Structure formats: C-alpha cells, structure tokens
Amino acid sequence: FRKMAFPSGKVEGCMVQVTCGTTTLNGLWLDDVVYCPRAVICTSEDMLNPNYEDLLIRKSNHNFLVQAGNVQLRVIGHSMQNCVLKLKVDTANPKTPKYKFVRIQPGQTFSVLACYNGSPSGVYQCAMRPNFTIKGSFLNGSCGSVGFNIDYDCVSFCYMHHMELPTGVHAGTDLEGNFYGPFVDRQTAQAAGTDTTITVNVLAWLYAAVINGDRWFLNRFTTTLNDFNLVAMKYNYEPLTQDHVDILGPLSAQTGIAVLDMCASLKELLQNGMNGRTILGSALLEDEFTPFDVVRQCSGVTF
Amino acid sequence: FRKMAFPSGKVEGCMVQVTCGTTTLNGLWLDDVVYCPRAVICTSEDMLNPNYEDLLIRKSNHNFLVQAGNVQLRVIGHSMQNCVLKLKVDTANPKTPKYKFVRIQPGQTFSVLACYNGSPSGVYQCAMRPNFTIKGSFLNGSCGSVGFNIDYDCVSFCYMHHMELPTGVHAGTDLEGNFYGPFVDRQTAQAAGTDTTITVNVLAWLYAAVINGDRWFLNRFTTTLNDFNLVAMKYNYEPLTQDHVDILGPLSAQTGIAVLDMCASLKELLQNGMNGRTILGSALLEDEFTPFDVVRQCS
C-alpha cells in the first residue's frame, strides 16, 4: 500500500520557464503553445488587486522570456484564457506526448510534478479534496507545476498550481484556466470550506482490505443509498453519487460484496468505534486511494 | 508533508524488456550494455535450485530477446557479474544519462521505478531497512526494476529488484549484483533478521512536523546522547551517533530546537506512547524520510 505516482518522464519533457520582468515561474510546452499562470505578468505591487486585462494590454510578445533549459523560445503571440496565459512560440515541442485536458472531480487522485525555474524537482500523488484544495508540497517559484494522470499512452493534464492558502493547503486551475473551488488569483485573504472525508475512496480502501484477507468489519446487514448519505453527513463524510456507486462496481464484483453492503459496514464503523482494531494495519481510515488506485496496485497497469 | 520521489524520466529512457525462453523481466540499458537479474535464464524447475554457471554456459547470444519498446536489440555478448547478467548489444542507448553505481547503507532512501514488460508503471520512495529489506510494491514480472537517486544531473543507481519474501517485503541487489542482506536468488522461503526503527530519520520527521506547526510533543527537557541511546536500544531503535547529530544540524538551526532537546521529546513518546494523537496526520512514528529528504522538501 504505497502511494504510487505515475512515471513523470512524458511531462518532464514539456516543462519550461517563463519570465516576465523579474518574475519567473513554470510553463507547459505542448505543440507550439506554452501554458502558464497569468500571475507571471504581476509585480509585487500588482498582486493585491491586479487588473489582469490592463496589465496584459501593456505587454507585447517581446516582454516574455520562455526558456527550455537555457535555450530561448521566441514568443510570437499571446492571449489570456481565464487564469492561464497562452504563449504561442515559434517551435513545436518534439517531445509533445499524446495528451488531453480534463477537469477532475473532488476525490480523484493525480500525480504532481513539482518544478522550480522550469526544472523538475519531485513527484508525488495527491487527491483533490472535497473543498477543492490539495494537501500538496509547494515552495515559492512552484507556480505552473502541473498535475496529471496517464491513461495507457495519453497524458491527462488536470491541474496547474497557482497559490497557497493561509492554512497551508494549495489551490489552482484546470488547464483551461478555471479555478477549482471559489478562489481567485490575487494575494488576498481566502479561506476554503470545511474539508470532509472522501467516502468513495474509504470504500475502495475497505475493498482492498477484503481482497487482502482483512475482513473482520463485514456485517450481516445492508442499507439504502439515501439512508447512508444522510448518516455520512453527520460524521463529515461526503455523500455518495451515482457515479461513485458505478466506479466501485469492479471491486464489488471481484469480492462479491455489494456496494450497499459495504456501506452498511462503514456505517457501523462510524457509529461504533474501531475498538483499537486495525484495517490494513492502520488505526485510521485512508481516503486518498481511488478505486482505480486500488486496481493499479493489485494488477500492475503500465504505460 | 508527502513522500516525494525523484522525477523518473532519466531512468524511463533506459528501461527495456528481456526475455529468455518463457521468462520475461526488465533490464537497464546503459550505453551498449543491458543489466538484468540472472534469474531470467531459469525455468520454473531451475529456480528451485539453480546452478547459474551451468545454466549460463548452456545459453547462446540468440537465446536472449531484448526489446526497447518496438525495436529488438541484438545481443552480441553476455557475461555474469554476481547476481546480474550483462548483455552486450549492438546499439548504444542515446538516452543514457550521466550515472554512477552506488551501494547504499540502511536508513538511506531512494526512488523505485516499478516496471512490467519493460514499461514504467509507477514511482515511489522507499528506505533500505536496517535488516536489508525494502517495503515495496512489486508484482509478478517486476524483477529488474531499479532504485535510484538523482544528484544534480547524475543518476545514482543503487538497487535492482529480485524477490519477495513470505512476509511481503522485498529484497534485491546493487548494480554490481551483490545482494543487500543474507538473501540468495533461489526460489525458497527466506526470512529476514529483526528490523529496527531508523532513529535519525524519525528525528528528521519530528523536525518536519515542527516546521509545519505540529508541536504538541515538545517539552522543555534535554537529555544526553548516551542516556537517549539506552532508551532507544531498549525499544529496538537504532542508536544515534555524533555523525547523526551533525547531519541534523540544519533542521536544528531552522527550528531553534537543539538535537538533544528533540531526543528528549522522542524519548517521552517511546516511553509514554502517542496516546491516540497524530503527528503530521500519522498515528505512527515515520522513519523513511532522511534529514536530506526533509531539507529538500522544506527549503
């Protein structure tokens, strides 16, 4: 039960640095376009209440320094799409993988390639919380780092990093520049909603425990989805959607345990204790493994 | 505070598939040599009690099928170095990074690139345990997956995967083919020695907790190095050396908590327990971050 990231090599070949004035951050170079946070056009003075449309009309193509390593890529056009800048460059990235842009749902996991000055530094797995933040690891200069999943030969980009909230958690946009959650890219006071436990992932973890022979928590009872959802909210657990029930299908089939039967078992654990007992050796329930993460580590999918 | 692995791209470019007969595993292609576990030359029957020198002399270059994705590489020589087979191929790998082969010490961490059929599957961070096992995530066909660290531009390869023990932990060799630990590449149940907790790593992690505002376990007390080590050994923790105290220097400087002060806090947790509380979200004392790992992630 390791938190396993996707291999990062296909994304590494797409990272560049983008500088405007003295502000440097990371960009993503796909075909002949570089994507990066529009915050790069701000000075320290602009960050409090930036007027991005006004800041951008005073920039031209030759104000942007795009480098792949120490090699400059000439900028030939620029536009703003929500909170991302799109810089058209004169060279198509020969390392461009097959890719798509996707907007993920809370509870989904993805790998983050943390970068500084356009150089990859580390990779880790994390989950999108129900309050649209991620518990990441990001230092100054990390903006423009991306999150991604790999789906056979296709890289699905789902996150670009923009900010850190005063509570220490992180927020960003999809690759169309739309924020996850109710945040804005300005250095203002912002707070996230209360975090909840990701129920669908806890259920995936319970199925993984059963697959490995740890099944003391199974009981003789079942529940309805509506009854379960109403109880879950009382314990700060996310309600299940119909999509959550369907993505649990394969694990339910593999173990022969119906989804709603597993819900009844989880409902028992919430109302009574765990009695100091453990599941997969842990005293606490894990909620950052999705159903697909469980299948990955029990089957060994490659890319 | 996350377990962060090194970016794997430099190693992905070196991974190939090696097949001998009915056995397929992964190999590492550097310049014009492919390194892989010698177990690839065994049948199911052979694996029970292999005489590797005999099995190797009975093979020719054409019994080895090496595939780099779609392209077959032609084997033009072969030799055995301890538990690793070196296959000479007619083509140099243009994506060979700057690299070195190092043998690591218990307590040190590295990234694993788990591969199947020559294709990368996942990356995660591990520590070499004091009993010379690693707690990995490896399935059938993962042999020849490698462990590595990245220093500036240089890839240091430190581990090649060979086996899973009955307890579910893993064992392998360095890239010179020498096992870590008392294990042999034979299909028999092998036990490892008693494991201990890596004390210097726990302290580094407690410093990371303080950096991130988790402070409940601190106290005003201090201890001596010898008095701490007496308690540590009683609880199956590795003793702390003066070398370890030196290496914790930067975290001590950044937090203003002396190392021996932190030791007094860890001593209390060992004696009293954590009492249902958590540190950095964990209910257990984590020992697979080195001091360098913490420094890397925190500044």
Ligand SMILES: *[C@H](O)[C@H](C[C@@H]1CCNC1=O)NC(=O)[C@H](CC(C)C)NC(=O)OCc1ccccc1
């Ligand atoms: C971009 O590299 C940077 C990433 C931050 C720096 C520390 N760790 C991170 O994840 N982002 C910013 O500096 C960002 C700038 C735009 C939002 C305009 N601002 C930010 O994260 O401010 C933090 C903050 C703002 C207001 C109150 C409290 C904290």
Ligand SMILES: *[C@H](O)[C@H](C[C@@H]1CCNC1=O)NC(=O)[C@H](CC(C)C)NC(=O)OCc1ccccc1
């Ligand atoms: C190589 O791909 C494979 C990796 C194993 C398979 C399951 N998980 C892994 O990490 N290694 C072997 O199959 C290895 C071959 C020897 C000749 C080195 N044998 C092995 O790991 O045996 C496990 C075992 C446990 C208990 C009794 C007997 C064998």
